[PDB]
Amino acid sequence: MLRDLFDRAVVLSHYIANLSSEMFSEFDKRYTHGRGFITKAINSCHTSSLATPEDKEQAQQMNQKDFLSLIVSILRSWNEPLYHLVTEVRGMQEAPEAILSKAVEIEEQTKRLLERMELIVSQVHPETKENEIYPVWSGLPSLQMADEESRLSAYYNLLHCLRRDSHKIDNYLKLLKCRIIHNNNC
Amino acid sequence: MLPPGKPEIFKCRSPNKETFTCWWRPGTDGGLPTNYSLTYHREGETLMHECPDYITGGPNSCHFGKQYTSMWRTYIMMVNATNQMGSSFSDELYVDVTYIVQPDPPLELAVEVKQPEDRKPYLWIKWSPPTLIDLKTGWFTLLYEIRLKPEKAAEWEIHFAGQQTEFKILSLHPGQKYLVQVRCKPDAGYWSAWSPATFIQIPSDF
Ligand SMILES: [Cl-]
Ligand code: NA
Ligand code: NA
Ligand code: NA
Fold first, then answer.
1. Which of A45, A132, B5, B54 could form a disulfide with A161 if both were Cys (CB 3.0 to 4.6 A apart)?
2. Which of residues 112-151 of A touch B (CB under 8 A)?
3. Count of domains forming chain B
4. By the 8 A CB rule, do B111 and B196 touch?
5. Are residues B95 and B106 in the same domain?
6. Quick one: which of B139, B27, B57, B183 has its CA closest to A62?
7. Does one domain contain both B143 and B168?
8. What is the CATH number of the domain that holds B184?
9. Who contacts B154 (Cβ-Cβ below 8 Å, separation ≥6)?
10. CATH number of the domain that residue A75 is part of
């Protein structure tokens, strides 16, 4: 039942996207606000290498099978870094209540969103190739660096990327919902 | 005889996630600029570009049309002021279009009193999204707020309408006249300004 499916998926993605923003802000005001960590962030996401549409036109031109697969690949690629973000922050002695709190929600909801997404692909495109191929994140050494400024800059890159990518998943899902269910007459 | 003060880009905005405009201001405490140049580059490119349109957003502004606008990609931009005496560069400004979206206000706000036999009568508010936003493809998602008040009341009544373009308000003082406005925000970004008021008379028999 596509309509309820897409509605659940979009409820999730919009929630996650909003949480990502609030998290990146709350980290930024508290830790980084005065300093040029914003400049270290220039093209440093583990998912940069993926071909993602960057404007509406590019979005419309994509075919819907590849587009769904894309969303799935991005979500899969985030399960590793969100696990370590949580483990690291939770393992601090004095863990900032706000941030950790959001981080845990994003982690859990993201699992659920990927379940709904995988289920969408099953209804809409049942004869797809069962093949994982998503970018690999391997930034844990940096999140664990003893140099504090280097450490903060790792975390900043990461939250900046999480915010971008969740906003992106959300937008793309909204787009596909209108396309698949409403022939782009939402 | 004085070269220009340091200029500042003090606002960027996107009305619909397809184009955007940025505005700068001259530094007072330098000479008069006779020219400005906005240059920028994007994240993960080394090409330097010039502002593509200095006209559209009027005075001291750079406007990026569809073909120069993309999401999820940082713009690194700088403006300089020059005159015959020399020059001065603004601080670099980092901009991600995704986070500077503020829609124009919603359109065609109409209000009507509906009095039916069988149920409580009501106020019926209707409006339209701003032109220029693509809701129908799903590229843009809009949320609305209504406010209303009779003149001289201290506080506005606020009602979140979600994604609907119409709303029903059940409880109003008979005979009293209300001002109603509506604004909207995207899923990520800033509330628009409130629309102009429409005024409605609540008839005495309500
Ligand atoms: Cl706002
Ligand atoms: Na614009
Ligand atoms: Na101009
Ligand atoms: Na564009």
1. A45
2. none
3. 2
4. no
5. no
6. B139
7. yes
8. 2.60.40.10
9. none
10. 1.20.1250.10
Q: Solved by what technique?
A: X-ray
Residue labelled with tokens 């939770």? A90
B199 φ, ψ (degrees, to nearest 5): -115, 135
| Under 8 Å between Cβ of A142 and A154 | yes
Q: Give, in order, the Cα–Cα distances in Å from B152 to each of B95, B156, B177.
A: 42, 10, 11
Q: What domain range includes position B192?
A: 102-206
Do A84 and A140 touch, CB atoms closer than 8 A?
yes
Residues sharing a CB contact under 8 Å with residue B168, sequence separation 6 or more, in sequence order: B122, B123, B124, B125
Q: Which ligand is nearest to the CA of B62?
A: 3
Query: Residue A154's domain spans which residues?
Result: 1-186
Interface of B with A in 95-124 (CB under 8 A): 96, 98
How many whole angstroms from A50 Cα to the centroid of ligand 1? 32
3-state SS assignment for residue B175 = coil
Q: Which of residues 21-40 of A touch B (CB under 8 A)?
A: 21, 38-39
- Nearest alpha carbon to residue A86 among A96, A98, A100: A100
Q: Which of B57, B85, B101 is the last residue of a domain?
A: B101
Q: In 3D, which of A37, A170, A78 has the Cα closest to residue B72? A: A170
Distance from CA of B135 to the nearest CA of A (A): 7
Tell me which of B101, B131, B163 is where a domain ends: B101
Mutation for testing the A interface, residue in B46, B75, B187 having most A CBs under 10 Å: B187
Residue entry with tokens 């919902």 = A177
Q: Give yes or no for A46 touching B (CB within 8 A).
A: no
Answer for the pair A156, A27: CB distance below 8 angstroms, yes or no. yes
